[PDB]
């Protein structure tokens, strides 16, 4: 619901939603939006839909379908280099979706915008070092850039405090034409736990596990740390509930 509420941020200003210990329904979110492009790295998309892992990390931003290739760790495109990076070590699933007309409460930004270049001038006048975004981190040059880039060509500069480093930080702003239907890119970086699986798919429990399915039948019961062989018969409640 927080992802649905409000307006999705730009790729550089992407907000982070983290779910550690809750039942998850990725399929329901996939049903709500129309996903034009689905891809995953280090795991199957079907496996990601139905598996238990220690934690789930979801990043939501407005990304157009046309520049999806640029935002890849393998790609040398500037947007991936200076805006959003996804950790290679954790399995990463990348989903691009277009909001349906029926879906409501999704505010649309005036245009999609990205940081064309992020660089820091060195203390030496003739020396400049480019700054490359580390995994996530919301981008190094995000502070100079406004939430939506004002013009297709923009120049941003700010000066770091000396000692350190007393070096100007320079950023570029670029924009792309807004699509009639808003397009949003989602980056997911779930972390698997060898001994811990706090977040599990909805609904993990099944009818066979439920006593009502096996009522009247000799069955093995493993409920709340008690293991035994017994037959369950429906009867009037007795004892402390």
């Amino acid at each position: 619901s927080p992802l649905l509420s409000g307006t999705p941020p730009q790729v550089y200003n992407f907000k982070r939603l983290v779910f550690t210990n809750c039942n998850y329904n990725l399929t329901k979110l996939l049903s709500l939006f129309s996903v034009n492009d689905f891809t995953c790295s280090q795991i199957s998309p079907a496996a990601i839909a139905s598996n238990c892992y220690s934690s789930l990390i979801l990043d939501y931003f407005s990304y157009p379908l046309s520049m999806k290739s640029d935002l890849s760790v393998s790609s040398a495109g500037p947007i991936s280099q200076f805006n959003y990076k996804q950790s290679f070590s954790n399995p990463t699933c990348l989903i691009l979706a277009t909001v349906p007309h029926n879906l409501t409460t999704i505010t649309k930004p005036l245009k999609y915008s990205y940081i064309n270049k992020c660089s820091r001038l060195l203390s030496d006048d003739r020396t400049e070092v480019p700054q490359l975004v580390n995994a996530n981190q919301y981008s190094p040059c995000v502070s100079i850039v406004p939430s939506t880039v004002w013009e297709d060509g923009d120049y941003y500069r700010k000066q770091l405090s000396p000692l350190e480093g007393g070096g100007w930080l320079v950023a570029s702003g670029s924009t792309v034409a807004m699509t009639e239907q808003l397009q949003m890119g989602f980056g997911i970086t779930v972390q698997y736990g060898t001994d811990t699986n706090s977040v599990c798919p909805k609904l993990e429990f099944a009818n066979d596990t439920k006593i009502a399915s096996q009522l009247g039948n000799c069955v093995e019961y493993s409920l709340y740390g008690v293991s035994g062989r017994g037959v369950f018969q429906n009867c009037t409640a007795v004892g402390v509930r």
Partner: antibody
Amino acid sequence: QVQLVQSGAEVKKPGSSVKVSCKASGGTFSSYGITWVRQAPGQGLEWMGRIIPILGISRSVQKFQGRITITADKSTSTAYMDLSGLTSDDTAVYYCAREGGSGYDFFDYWGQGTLVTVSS
Amino acid sequence: EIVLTQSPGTLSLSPGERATLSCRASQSVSSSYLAWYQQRPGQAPRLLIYGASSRATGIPDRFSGSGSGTDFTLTIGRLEPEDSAVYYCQQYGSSPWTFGQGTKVEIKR
């Protein structure tokens, strides 16, 4: 403070490729944008193009877009504009002005200027 | 691109008399996004006020920027022969930024 200087005035035939050169003094380029301004005689100044050498980005006015190629290099320390296919009416004095940034489009210093006349 | 009205231009002004220049904008522009440029005859324009709020470094305090949104007025506390020049108001709120038509100032001692 960097003093701003411009190439000597030149005369070219209409449609010829003409380059106006503005050089940052000291052999090094500060982290500032470079703007090109065309002023027609007895007329208000008109912005032609904006190039930042450190950024490497190039921008041009809608009136004169794609007829001018602008290249600025920090290592060269010189920002130059190349204009090709310009009409005879286009002749005007050209000025290069320092830019604080997109948020600060005011020019603290202006180049001496180059007068280019296009006539056959 | 915003079309901007300008003061008529050449005026006869005695020294020590305040001078006001009008820079109305047909299209709405940012409340403080206007640059004043003064060019001496055969000289490059030099910024006097940035944002029509504060004088640029090395510019006399007598020149002042007043007005917001549509009409911008440049008022000079004292007038000198050196003060006489052509003044342009540039609105950088909308790109491409549009320079003022300009107003020649004449001082006859």
